[PDB]
Amino acid sequence: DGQCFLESDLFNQGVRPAINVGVSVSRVGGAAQIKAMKEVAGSLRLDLSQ
Amino acid sequence: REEIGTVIDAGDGIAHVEGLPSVMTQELLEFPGGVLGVALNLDEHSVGAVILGEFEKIEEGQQVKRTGEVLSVPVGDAFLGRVVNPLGQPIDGQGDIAAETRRALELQAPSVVQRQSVSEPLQTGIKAIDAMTPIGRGQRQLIIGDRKTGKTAVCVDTILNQREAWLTGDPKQQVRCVYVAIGQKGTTIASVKRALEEGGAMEYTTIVAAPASDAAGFKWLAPYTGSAIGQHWMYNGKHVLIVFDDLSKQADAYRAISLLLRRPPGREAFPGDVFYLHSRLLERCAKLSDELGGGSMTGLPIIETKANDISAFIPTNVISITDGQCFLESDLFNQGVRPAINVGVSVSRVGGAAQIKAMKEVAGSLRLDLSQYRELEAFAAFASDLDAASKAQLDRGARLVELLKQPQYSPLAVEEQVVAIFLGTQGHLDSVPVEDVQRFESELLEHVKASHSDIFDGIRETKKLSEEAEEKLVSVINEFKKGFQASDGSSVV
Amino acid sequence: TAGRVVRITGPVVDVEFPRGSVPELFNALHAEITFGALAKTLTLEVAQHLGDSLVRCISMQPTDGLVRGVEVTDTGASISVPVGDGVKGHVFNALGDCLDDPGYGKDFEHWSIHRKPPAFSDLEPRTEMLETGLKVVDLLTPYVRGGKIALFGGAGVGKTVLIQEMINRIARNFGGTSVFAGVGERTREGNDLWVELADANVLKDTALVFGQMDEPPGTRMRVALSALTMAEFFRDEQGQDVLLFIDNIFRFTQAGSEVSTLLGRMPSAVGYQPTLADEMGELQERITSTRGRSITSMQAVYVPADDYTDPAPATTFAHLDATTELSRAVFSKGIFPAVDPLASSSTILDPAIVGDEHYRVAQEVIRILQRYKDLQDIIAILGIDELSEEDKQLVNRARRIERFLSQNMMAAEQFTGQPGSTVPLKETIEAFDKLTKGEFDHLPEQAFFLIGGLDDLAKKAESL
Amino acid sequence: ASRRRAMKSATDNADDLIKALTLAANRERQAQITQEISEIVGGANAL
């Protein structure tokens, strides 16, 4: 119900989490998160992908 | 009296029978409930058989009878305007069909000494291939491409182009038409039949169909019965044109039926002999000599390919077998060229003796500037710096490539095609916006059918053009050019 | 006359019978498990006739605990399911058992599940139109009433949310009946879909049946037949327009594959069974709707390994019309509707049937997109300045086109936090004609993202 | 003049790259064909 992708290129690049926002999703989405996080965060994933 | 056997195995449309010592190979067999079978693999212990028709009505106690017959089909002359299953029964409720003779499906092709050269035109409605790659009687042409490119449209246009020829009572110009539909959706069959019926061409054509629901192996032998139907007329000094909707599904069905029993698999699990099947199927069409009567058969097969991989097994085999090739690119179809046919690689290996001399004259001129425009397309960015000759060649190529495209379900007469091509290749397209090029000529063509139809009659009678004809045409062109109004302003020469 | 089991190996079982009492094909048999920890009543379906009066059968539920010598009882008929209008409003098992309450509707009429398709004479082409309220579908791949619709794509693309959006868009306010089936889907989706349907007022006129992934291979290739039996009964007897929903039909094919090895069948090119095309064709032929009656069927199929040259999808393409395709690049670049405009088309589109302006607009936009693609292939390296004014104009117009082509959605509003909307067809065609004209070149592309209609365009543009 | 020289050098650098890519693609295709034929024949004769 969700996947996280780690590539060695990003880890080498200098991103310690080393995860790409392009192909990482979550089925549940905002339902799991606490509401305050939901309003604060917003659609940051789409902005990062853009 | 007759030998009777039993059933030992049953599954996936395969049955094994023990008995029948006198049975011959490929002999039709009878099972209770009116079930048909074909013997295809003999052995000292038992004989295999593929099941035709009902399947779940088979158990281990059934009795088997032999028909003492190999394979045959009623091949009478009453099949025109009827839809028939590959076995021979009529699908529709119109009633049965009167028949006159029964012939086998495994007859030898005509020999070398019985052949003859090919020189007849066999004209079609598509101007994109008539002037590019001529097609003649008794010659094999293949069309290749990807799905949703529009090949069936070309097929049906060629089929329905023969109306005017059928109108005359001359048996030396009437052409019969056979269509074979293999492994398709029934709604598509209904739609194409309706299109033919509303086109009025159903009176001289026949359709044999095997939808996707035929698990009995009917998909294995539909082309055989189509060719058997055609051959009876072709042996009587009559010209026939046969179309196979697809052949890849035939190969898949053969591969499945071979794998179900024991067969050593080669490349891609294909059975031992695939090339032989297509070769022996496609070597029936031939132009007979004058002594035999002069009948002819022209075939049109179809092959589907994936991702433009022309290096696969079946496409390579069929390309090796066939006599001419035509290519369709989905990229061109998306580009805006309705006849997606690619002139770059498609080649017909006949000597060009099929076509008539005027279009023979004009095609040579067409080839040169087509190649020039094809090679000189990169300089579009800096067209200002090029030379005048290069600019003229580029403009001529643009007008030509704009001229060829046509809408579907619109066959063209040969006189009309010749006039259009002659108009295109004589520089009369200058000072004309490219878009209106598609419109203008059509309207102009109509005017010729109104007041000056004698030119078409002269072309029909003489198969050529004279000086008076060309001066009349140039006069008519000069008359009409001023009358026509451009979509953007106006300009004439 | 009972017979006995001789071999047990995974899902497949081997049974022998006394001479003369061999059951016919596709029958049903009963077996008992006597272990205390797990007690069940196994139902077996015969599938292979062999010599010496032995039969190979497939199992319906897991076979753990079975032993040799256990007697078997024969039913003498194929499996049957309850029929009638008294079944709708309940969730049912693959065999017809009501999950909500056991022993419900067992007095209903039950009949065969395996039947022949109709005759060719009754077939008739169906040409029509139905609105959807989605920008891409209403323009490029219009649908049709009474036809077949399918959604193609790979894994992790967003098929389920589109299915839910479509049922919310169409199933609501529908005069007739709707039937939904679930093949090899995630159980959480089944539960939340049931809850959502219970939330509204349509569950009173819907019949649900589905089997999950945890079930053995016997079940994964049988539920679709039950759904088709129910739909056929409703179409033939009551005679009203019906909707059919099927998810991930590809799993059905997979259900065969493993058994293909156990039954002894030789493998095909990619390890597939040699006889997939015939079975899929039988199913698709059974789907058909004759003239005088209407069935609107929508399906979703799964592309394995994101490869379109696999043997299975070719037959799906053959038995179809008016399809849609989902790709991965647009999903990567943040476009929620992952449809690829350059690889989807519909048969119904025709200047005679639909109209001329629609056709010209579609041709213009698809040509523009193709030109943008093969221009970007070089401009990605040689730089923007390498082209002329016309090329840059076309690139900018195309960029605006793909930006504007997205939309907000009903069932996905929770992720965005803002409810979506729907648009009329005339507004869509006028807006796209204006875009092709080249008037919106003065606005930034960011205004075209996740928009609906044109008033929202104006509001968002003025917001910046 | 410098632009002419550089562009000529670029073309002469691109052509052999195309050739090498073609060779690699051909060897990959042959390897694939051998792989699937070996797999299918092994599965077939394993019975």
Ligand SMILES: Nc1ncnc2c1ncn2[C@@H]1O[C@H](COP(=O)(O)OP(=O)(O)OP(=O)(O)O)[C@@H](O)[C@H]1O
């Ligand atoms: N000359 C043409 N002008 C306009 N539209 C055309 C033309 N030729 C074909 N089309 C259209 O293109 C589509 C191709 O249909 P068609 O069935 O002939 O394709 P195909 O390549 O044979 O594929 P398949 O048999 O798999 O459906 C149809 O929508 C048809 O109306």
Ligand SMILES: Nc1ncnc2c1ncn2[C@@H]1O[C@H](COP(=O)(O)OP(=O)(O)O)[C@@H](O)[C@H]1O
């Ligand atoms: N319009 C949309 N808005 C937000 N997320 C979407 C949208 N469409 C698809 N998704 C994403 O797609 C995922 C669902 O994919 P899914 O249909 O389960 O793939 P598959 O069909 O391969 O299982 C969800 O996690 C969701 O985040």
Ligand SMILES: [Mg+2]
């Ligand atoms: Mg077609």
Ligand SMILES: [Mg+2]
């Ligand atoms: Mg999903």
